[PDB]
Amino acid sequence: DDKTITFWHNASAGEGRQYWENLAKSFEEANPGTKVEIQAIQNEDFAGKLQTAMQDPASGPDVFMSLGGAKTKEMIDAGQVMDLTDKISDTVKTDMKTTLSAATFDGKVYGVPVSVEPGGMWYSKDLFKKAGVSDVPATYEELLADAKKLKDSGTDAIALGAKDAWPAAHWYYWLVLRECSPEVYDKSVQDHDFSNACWVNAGKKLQELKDLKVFNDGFLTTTAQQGANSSAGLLANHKAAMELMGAWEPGVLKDLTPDQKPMADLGFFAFPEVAGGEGEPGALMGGVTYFCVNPKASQTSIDFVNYMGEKKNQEDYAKAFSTIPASEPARAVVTDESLKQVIEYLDKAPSMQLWMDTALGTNIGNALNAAVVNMLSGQGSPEDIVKAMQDAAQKG
Numbered sequence: 001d002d003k004t005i006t007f008w009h010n011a012s013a014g015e016g017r018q019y020w021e022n023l024a025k026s027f028e029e030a031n032p033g034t035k036v037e038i039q040a041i042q043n044e045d046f047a048g049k050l051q052t053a054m055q056d057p058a059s060g061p062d063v064f065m066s067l068g069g070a071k072t073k074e075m076i077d078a079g080q081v082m083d084l085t086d087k088i089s090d091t092v093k094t095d096m097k098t099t100l101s102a103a104t105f106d107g108k109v110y111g112v113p114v115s116v117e118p119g120g121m122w123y124s125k126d127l128f129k130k131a132g133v134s135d136v137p138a139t140y141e142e143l144l145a146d147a148k149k150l151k152d153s154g155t156d157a158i159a160l161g162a163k164d165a166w167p168a169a170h171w172y173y174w175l176v177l178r179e180c181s182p183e184v185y186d187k188s189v190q191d192h193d194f195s196n197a198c199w200v201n202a203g204k205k206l207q208e209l210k211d212l213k214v215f216n217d218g219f220l221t222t223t224a225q226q227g228a229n230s231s232a233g234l235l236a237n238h239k240a241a242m243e244l245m246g247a248w249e250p251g252v253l254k255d256l257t258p259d260q261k262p263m264a265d266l267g268f269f270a271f272p273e274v275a276g277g278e279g280e281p282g283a284l285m286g287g288v289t290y291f292c293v294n295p296k297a298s299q300t301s302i303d304f305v306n307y308m309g310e311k312k313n314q315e316d317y318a319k320a321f322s323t324i325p326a327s328e329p330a331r332a333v334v335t336d337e338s339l340k341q342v343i344e345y346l347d348k349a350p351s352m353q354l355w356m357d358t359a360l361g362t363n364i365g366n367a368l369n370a371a372v373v374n375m376l377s378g379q380g381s382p383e384d385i386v387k388a389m390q391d392a393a394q395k396g
């Protein structure tokens with residue numbers, strides 16, 4: 001039925017999951033005859049499920065969440081994503097000007113942005129003060145010193161969801177961004193060239209952190225977002241002082257607290273600078289989430305993604321997910337103090353790179369993430385990370 005659509009997203013729990021149900025219901029109410037069938041998928045399963053399903057578009061989802069960067073382009077090249085250049089609404093064109101570039105490939109728009117999530121450190125202001133950290137660390141050495149103080153003060157300095165691999169890899173991404181010159185970074189990512197020494201130095205700096213033993217003890221078996229003992233869960237329940245994460249963080253924390261209300265003393269600060277690094281000061285890394293349409297989908301799917309972009313729906317999105325909506329005017333309803341600081345951060349950043357693994361693609365990205373975990377587990381080295389990336393890059 002041309003008016004029945006299958007909708008895949010990654011909000012498997014909490015208010016985010018309920019938001020999509022409500023949006024679907026409101027869409028069905030506003031467009032009688034339409035039916036939205038939802039599949040709420042756990043984030044760590046999403047890419048695998050989507051890529052497998054879209055090998056046969058005729059039986060794949062009509063509307064699905066983006067993977068981002070080269071991972072999107074992979075799907076575009078394979079004929080698994082509809083060009084929406086001439087399909088997106090004036091509302092989207094107007095309100096998502098800044099974020100549409102993330103969904104734009106070869107001058108063509110392939111999705112409707114719904115959220116923007118810069119990365120950085122999310123921390124407990126209370127645990128920081130208890131360790132004698134009165135100022136967020138401007139530099140990496142100061143961050144390391146602060147971790148020592150947090151450890152001495154009887155808490156786990158850094159929550160790390162290393163079982164999911166990418167949360168660990170985020171430390172590596174940021175260190176490369178801080179170490180590599182903007183030129184080397186852009187060329188390295190575009191050409192898949194990882195020969196510059198900065199790719200090794202970043203690994204060595206991360207190994208230094210790991211050898212301080214300031215992670216939560218079970219970090220290798222810790223997921224990012226599943227349960228009270230996930231890395232987000234540890235931060236939410238003040239069992240750990242900080243974690244490096246995207247700006248979806250506040251909404252994940254709020255559903256892992258014992259009363260499932262927002263974390264009271266949540267603070268944010270940008271990933272610090274690295275002495276001797278030639279990275280651009282203030283450079284941002286993050287993600288933009290947009291929703292895509294199956295090339296075989298009907299106009300009903302197009303209407304649904306455009307419906308997401310409507311100001312009221314983006315405002316409800318911001319409230320449900322406690323994150324930054326892609327729609328600029330919708331950002332007015334953002335109340336969380338740390339999110340307001342990230343928005344400012346975002347508004348005057350010199351540039352924003354996409355998450356390194358998404359920017360590099362599935363093969364390199366997955367190889368990189370696993371290699372970072374191997375080093376953190378002591379079964380690998382900084383050199384092995386580069387070798388893993390190079391090996392994977394041979395396939396593309």
Ligand SMILES: OC[C@@H]1O[C@@H](O[C@@H]2[C@@H](O)[C@H](O[C@@H]3CO[C@@H](O)[C@H](O)[C@H]3O)OC[C@H]2O)[C@H](O)[C@H]1O
Nearest residue numbers: 010011043115166248287289321323355357358
């Ligand atoms: O918009 C609010 C919620 O946040 C997004 O979901 C995020 C998702 O984007 C994130 O993807 C990670 C990003 O880092 C990459 O390195 C990694 O490969 C990738 O898996 O995972 C966390 C999840 O909360 C969605 O827009 C929405 O659920």
